[PDB]
A paper describes a structure:
Roundabout (Robo) receptors provide an essential repulsive cue in neuronal development following Slit ligand binding. The Drosophila and vertebrate [name]-3 are most similar, containing five immunoglobulin (Ig) and three fibronectin (Fn) domains in their extracellular region. Here we present the crystal structure of [name] [name]-4 and [name] Ig5, together with a negative stain electron microscopy reconstruction of the [name] ectodomain. These results show how the [name] ectodomain is arranged as compact dimers, mainly mediated by the central Ig domains, which can further interact in a “back-to-back” fashion to generate a tetrameric assembly.
The [name] [name]-4 domains are arranged in an extended conformation, ∼170 Å in length, with essentially no polypeptide linker between any of the four domains. Two potential N-glycosylation sites at N160 and N175 were identified by sequence analysis. A close inspection of the electron density for these residues reveals clear glycosylation at N160, while N175 is most likely not glycosylated. Nevertheless, four crystallographic contact interfaces are observed. The first results in a dimeric arrangement between 2-fold symmetric molecules along the b axis, and is primarily mediated by the Ig4 domain. This interface, which spans residues 378–394 and 429–436, has the largest buried surface (663 Å2 of each molecule's surface area), and is predominantly hydrophobic in nature. The last interface, which buries 466 Å2 from each molecule, is mediated exclusively by residues 71–72, 86–96, and 122–126 from one [name] domain interacting with residues 79–84, 115–120, and 128–131 from the second [name]. Both interaction surfaces partially overlap with the Slit2 D2 binding surface on [name], but Slit2 D2 binding to the first is more extensive compared with the second. Several independent ab initio runs yielded reproducible molecular shapes, and the average models generated are consistent with the [name] [name]-4 structure obtained. The fit directly computed from the atomic model of [name] [name]-4 yields a very good agreement with the experimental SAXS profile and a χ2 = 1.4.
Numbering used by the authors: 63 to 396, 401 to 447
The structure:
Amino acid sequence: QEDFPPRIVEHPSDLIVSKGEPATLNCKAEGRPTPTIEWYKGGERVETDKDDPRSHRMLLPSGSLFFLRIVHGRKSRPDEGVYVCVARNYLGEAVSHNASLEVAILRDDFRQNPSDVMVAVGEPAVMECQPPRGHPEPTISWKKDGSPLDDKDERITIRGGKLMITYTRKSDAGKYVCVGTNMVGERESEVAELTVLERPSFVKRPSNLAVTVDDSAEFKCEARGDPVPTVRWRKDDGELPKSRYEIRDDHTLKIRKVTAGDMGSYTCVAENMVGKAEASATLTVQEPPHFVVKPRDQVVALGRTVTFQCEATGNPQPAIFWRREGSQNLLFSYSSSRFSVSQTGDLTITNVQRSDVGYYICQTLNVAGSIITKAYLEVTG
Ligand SMILES: *[C@@H]1O[C@H](CO)[C@@H](O)[C@H](O)[C@H]1NC(C)=O
């Protein structure tokens, strides 16, 4: 067929190429005679090996341009740019579509590094990140203690450049890093430790104690929490007894040679940086009984009613009971008879008879002590 002008069949395609690696910008054209190919970087002639065999750019018989390496530095940049191939034969000129030849880049320092988080168990946890500068744009991923982290958990959600934990479990604690990845490689960010702190609480709390005079007293107290909580005893109404207290290694409070006045309430206090827990117990000093009111010997006329007063005060409130001098039968606060004992301790004999004559013993007792006193009854006409 009679000679024809050039017609570009294949055009050069845009290309992003890794730091120092060969590149190929394809360009095929038809025409008779075979059209000579020339490359132009923004209109300027590209000096190839088919111009000077010292240039790192090679023009192929297939009309394609091969780059043996990519030149990108702080002083020179002759490979990066916009290219067009031109097919020229006996009569005619063909110009192709343009193509880009950009160097792939990925910097070191991050646009935003993940920061540490100190939360309580259950509180949500968020982590912010932005990858280091890079073209094409780097893709964000996360790692927990070397191993890669997944969105798989219902709570864990990775969106854009954020990490969200809806509720924290102790198991989420650890060292976290943000990974930026494009074609150049990977960049692992700065370590952002996440700590799951527990508020203070009591494993074993104090028990209310009743202890008599001169005996020692013990109040047990064990606490938990992360970080390990400091444990310190209080005295709600004053201070601890100088030279009479001792805080053991187990955290238990001991008051030696107890004397009334110690009688009150003591508090165990557990405290850490995330919270504070308190627990109370009372100490009961037990004083032996003493007679407020003692019965007095009295004469009652036949058939009338007599009351013998007996009132006592001790710690705890001491119980009271009567008994006739020779008898075994003990009289308490209610079968019924003419004899009765009031709640406060008084004995009342109703419709008296000559048989009722004699001493009536009053007896008070509590865990600490016991006291006795009597009074005579004289039945007359
Ligand atoms: C590349 O071709 C486009 C048309 O697709 C044109 O807009 C642009 O100016 C050309 N680029 C250069 C640097 O000449």
